[PDB]
């Protein structure tokens, strides 16, 4: 019944490490820690190893570079046809499972919630798939004439058999007069979704930006921004966009949720890149800073603390007019914020949460939970890098359990030991946690709800956490005769 949280977390680490054979144990030990007291402001200090190979056989939660490129970066771009290039599986499992929302007539002007594939058969593996790919491109040009560009998302066999998709892309671009983007996101590359992000960002650079300007007529304003790294999960980017426009900015493009190829192409015309997902798109921001002198800045639209801070931070880079717009937006939504807090904070305050998500949300959502009086007692990333773990110290407190590339065994034991009031993670984690009698909310798909970004999203976030935790189902777990 009584515990010292930091020490109890350390004991859980010792317990799980004892379960491994020696070789795996030595690898895993560097990925598990407890946040320490810190020496803008760092709340905690943490050394955790990250962004290295997974250990075989341990039940990692990670995905691959193809997920990071096709599933994450490219797939949401609505007016392109994305070919899942290789056998049928990858593009079947990833067909419409990421809720990167868009407005379009699917199959006609927009192609997101579809699978396009080269459906490799054994002949394609033996003889190569480039001729098939050329034909595929012709078939797309004919049957999907309003597609503005085509991407080629390489699955595992492409690089293994020596196909030359870049040659195909050059050849067909000249023939059909539409951008063709070859992406080398084969799943054998890297260790996770992360390298897919970076490969995909480089492909935007190399095959979209590295081309003649198609928007010479674009009229610029002093307040033109790109939102970079908001994939519009459940409309998150739309609930963010409204605030930015109310403050007085003009959003030239939002990468890549609800994005069109034209929006991506125009990005170098903006005055500033606002980056939400640092992990997935910092690469292209760094490039745009170097090549076009466009500065970039990180922000956070989860919960009122972060939204207000973000609006102020962003506005301070412009002028007094936009600074005033920030204050006006914060004031406009204060009655909503207060209403959400008054309704839900009494129902949620004091509850403890464990998180596990990919590259951003493991830190980014923490202050939204704290705005409802909830505390984070464990967090971790599937594929965060050292610079994500360092940023996490701005958000989590001393004593928080930290787990990089957590294994199914570890995370089970940690949840069973801690018994948090709520777990926030993915689909592979949801059902075992609920069977334990612990509330769970999906932190990728938003459990088919959302948006969670922005002021309108904060109300939904609160509602969803409350309905998961304060529900009659939990009281029915134990049969009355047991």
């Amino acid at each position: 019944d009584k515990t010292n949280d930091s020490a109890f977390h350390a004991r859980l680490i010792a317990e799980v490490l004892e379960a491994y054979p020696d070789k795996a144990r030595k690898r895993r030990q560097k990925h598990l820690n407890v946040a320490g007291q810190a020496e803008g402001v760092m709340l905690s200090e943490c050394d955790v190893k990250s962004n290295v190979k997974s250990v075989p056989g341990v039940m990692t939660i990670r995905g691959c570079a193809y997920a990071g490129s096709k599933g994450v970066v490219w797939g949401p771009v609505k007016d392109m046809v994305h070919i899942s290039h290789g056998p049928v599986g990858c593009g079947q499992y990833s067909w419409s499972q990421r809720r990167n929302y868009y407005i379009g007539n699917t199959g006609v002007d927009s192609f997101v919630t579809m699978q396009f594939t080269s459906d490799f058969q054994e002949k394609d593996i033996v003889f190569g798939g480039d001729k098939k790919l050329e034909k595929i491109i012709d078939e797309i040009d004919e049957l999907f004439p309003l597609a503005k560009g085509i991407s080629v998302q390489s699955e595992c066999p492409i690089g293994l058999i020596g196909d030359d998709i870049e040659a195909v892309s050059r050849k067909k671009k000249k023939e059909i007069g539409k951008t063709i983007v070859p992406v080398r996101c084969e799943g054998f590359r890297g260790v996770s979704q992360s390298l897919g992000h970076h490969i995909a960002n480089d492909a935007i650079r190399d095959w979209v930006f590295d081309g003649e300007d198609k928007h010479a007529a674009f009229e610029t304003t002093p307040y033109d921004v790109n939102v970079i790294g908001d994939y519009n999960i459940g409309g998150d980017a739309w609930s963010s966009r409204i605030l930015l426009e109310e403050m007085g900015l003009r959003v030239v493009g939002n990468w890549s949720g609800d994005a069109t190829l034209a929006e991506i192409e125009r990005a170098p015309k903006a005055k500033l890149n606002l980056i939400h997902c640092y992990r997935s798109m910092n690469y292209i921001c760094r490039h745009m800073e170097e090549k076009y002198n466009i500065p970039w800045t990180e922000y956070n639209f989860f919960g009122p603390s972060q939204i207000a801070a973000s609006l102020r931070k962003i506005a301070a880079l412009f002028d007094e007019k936009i600074q005033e717009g920030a204050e006006r937006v914060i004031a406009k939504y204060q009655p909503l914020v207060d209403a959400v807090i008054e309704k839900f904070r009494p129902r949620l305050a004091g509850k403890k949460v464990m998180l596990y998500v990919g590259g951003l949300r493991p830190r980014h959502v923490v202050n939204a939970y704290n705005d409802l009086g909830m505390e984070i007692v464990g967090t971790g990333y599937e594929f965060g890098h050292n610079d994500d773990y360092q940023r996490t110290g701005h958000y989590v407190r001393e004593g928080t359990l930290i787990y990089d590339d957590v294994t199914g065994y570890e995370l089970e034991k940690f949840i069973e030991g801690i018994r948090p009031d709520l777990v926030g993670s993915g689909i592979k984690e949801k059902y075992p946690v609920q069977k334990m009698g612990i509330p769970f909310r999906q932190m990728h798909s938003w459990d088919y709800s959302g948006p969670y970004h922005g002021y309108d999203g904060f109300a939904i976030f609160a509602r969803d956490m409350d309905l998961a935790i304060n529900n009659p189902v939990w009281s029915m777990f134990k049969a009355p005769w047991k």
């Binding site: 075989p56 007539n105 594939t117 490799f120 309003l146 066999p157 909503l336 689909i427 069977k435 309108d456």
Partner: protein, 510 residues
């Protein structure tokens, strides 16, 4: 605006006036085609001319209705007692397989990867197998580890048998520990092929080199089945009533339906390892889905077993055929309680058949499902006009043609093997049918062509718990019948609900 008294999430929120205005502003700069061009192209994609170009595709697949082999391998392995699926190859695959199964069953799905990376293209995956098996065995305490492969492992050509023997030589697992294996290449066949390959590998592991001690039992293989939970329980109920001596080979019905009672069960139920071992002794093996088992049945025949395959038995006649076969094997009659169930089903069909006669359908899915569903439709006086299976062969098309030819309601029906849901969309747009029977991907066909969808095929991601109830047996047939009728009656009421315009036909009794 948002309102804390009646919170609006995405669906209603973005219809608020401020969002409509914002999105209209965004559209001005997207460089998307103008509305009249969108209408022109949309109409064209519903034409006969487009249908012809669409059906002339040679290389591009669009919205195929099939998965890759390892999904089937994971599925079949999950039906053995305390068995962990170990997919040698790239880990992205395993995240996907597990998520796909979990979304359909609303349940955990456990499997592991050997986590091969680019290093293996040069050096091979030996250390991934050795270390991986050691880690899986120690962490997850399986009774058996069933090894399959991802497409990279197939291309690289790792020797599974040698790697596993080396793993045992290094002490990754005990020498007697069961590590059956199969090659499951994504670029051959589909998930059904992976089911077959993996199951053959399991049986071969246990049977190789043995001489049977013949007994009169029958082994029963259910196949890759979205309704496995309800179906296997129904199968067991039927078998129990008949008194047949049997072994089900791969039973996922507990594994994908564990309770929520405060304990997470990583493993539950499944074919006992000793039952799988003893299954070699049976005189008969039957498969409920021909296309999930041909290599497996050939292997069973190599031990002198007699085999039979069915096609996802749905409805009165297919159930009759299964029971008659079980009766022939076992020497037991069909008991009175089952005949009563049959007569109750016939009663229901005769009561309702005015709503079913002459209904036209499109049906897609796995080859056995499509066949079985078409057969049941024909028994109702319906017309399975557009039957399609992305993973259906020419031999399957021929079997479907024989089925169509057996009934006057099959005239004009066609079976399209190797075609995808974009092909299906052109069929639905040009030769309209009343109802579409498929999986959740068919919702896009419902949207695009206004053909209502009934979900009776894996995966069902947008309705909950349907898998818990049978579609096999007389009972499952009755369930399917009510599902079909409820869809028809819901549409009849929707078509007649407009006051003073269409509600002259809004009948209280139907």
């Amino acid at each position: 605006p948002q309102n804390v008294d009646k919170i609006l999430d995405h669906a209603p929120l973005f219809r608020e006036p401020e969002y409509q205005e914002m999105l209209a502003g965004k559209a001005k700069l997207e460089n998307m085609p103008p509305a009249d061009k969108v209408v022109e192209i949309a109409d064209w994609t519903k034409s006969w001319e487009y249908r012809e170009k669409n059906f002339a595709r040679e290389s591009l697949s669009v919205n195929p209705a099939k998965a890759c082999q390892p999904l089937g391998a994971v599925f079949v392995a999950s039906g053995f007692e305390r068995t962990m699926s170990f997919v040698h190859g790239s880990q992205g695959c395993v995240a996907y397989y597990r998520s796909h199964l979990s979304r359909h069953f609303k349940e955990p799905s456990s499997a592991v990867s050997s986590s091969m990376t680019e290093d293996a293209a040069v050096f091979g995956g030996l250390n991934n197998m050795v270390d991986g098996l050691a880690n899986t065995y120690k962490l997850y305490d399986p009774k058996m580890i069933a090894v399959s492969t991802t497409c990279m492992a197939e291309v690289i050509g790792d020797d599974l048998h040698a790697f596993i023997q080396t793993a045992k030589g290094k002490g990754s697992v005990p020498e007697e520990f069961d590590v059956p294996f199969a090659h499951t290449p994504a670029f051959v066949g589909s998930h059904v092929t992976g089911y077959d390959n993996m199951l053959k590998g399991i049986l071969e592991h246990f049977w190789k080199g043995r001489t049977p001690v013949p007994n009169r039992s029958v082994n029963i293989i259910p196949g890759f089945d979205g309704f496995a939970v309800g179906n296997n329980r129904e199968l067991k109920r039927i078998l129990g009533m008949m008194g047949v001596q049997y072994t089900i080979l791969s039973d996922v019905s507990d594994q994908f339906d564990t309770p929520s009672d405060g304990e997470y069960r990583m493993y539950d139920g499944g074919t006992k390892i000793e039952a799988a071992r003893d299954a070699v002794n049976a005189d008969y093996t039957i498969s409920l889905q021909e296309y999930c088992t041909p290599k497996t049945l050939e292997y069973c025949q190599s031990f002198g077993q007699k085999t039979a395959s069915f096609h996802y038995p749905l409805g009165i006649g297919a159930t009759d055929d299964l029971l008659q076969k079980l009766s022939e094997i076992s020497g037991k009659p069909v008991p009175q309680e089952l005949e009563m169930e049959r007569g109750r089903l016939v009663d229901a069909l005769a009561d309702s058949q005015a709503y079913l006669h002459g209904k036209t359908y499109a049906i897609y899915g796995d080859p056995d499902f499509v066949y079985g569903m078409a057969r049941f439709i024909l028994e109702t006086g319906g017309e399975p006009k557009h039957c399609l299976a992305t993973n259906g062969s020419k031999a399957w098309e021929a079997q479907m043609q024989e089925l169509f030819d057996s009934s006057p309601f099959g005239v004009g029906c066609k079976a399209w093997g190797g075609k995808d849901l974009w092909h299906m969309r052109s069929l639905l747009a040009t030769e309209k049918v009343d109802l579409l029977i498929g999986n959740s991907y068919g919702k896009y066909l419902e949207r695009d062509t206004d053909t209502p969808l009934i979900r009776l095929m894996f995966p069902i991601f947008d309705r909950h718990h349907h898998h818990r109830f049978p579609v096999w047996g007389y009972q499952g047939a009755l369930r399917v019948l009510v599902t079909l009728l409820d869809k028809i009656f819901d549409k009849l009421d929707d078509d007649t609900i407009q006051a003073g315009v269409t509600d002259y036909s809004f009948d209280l009794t139907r």
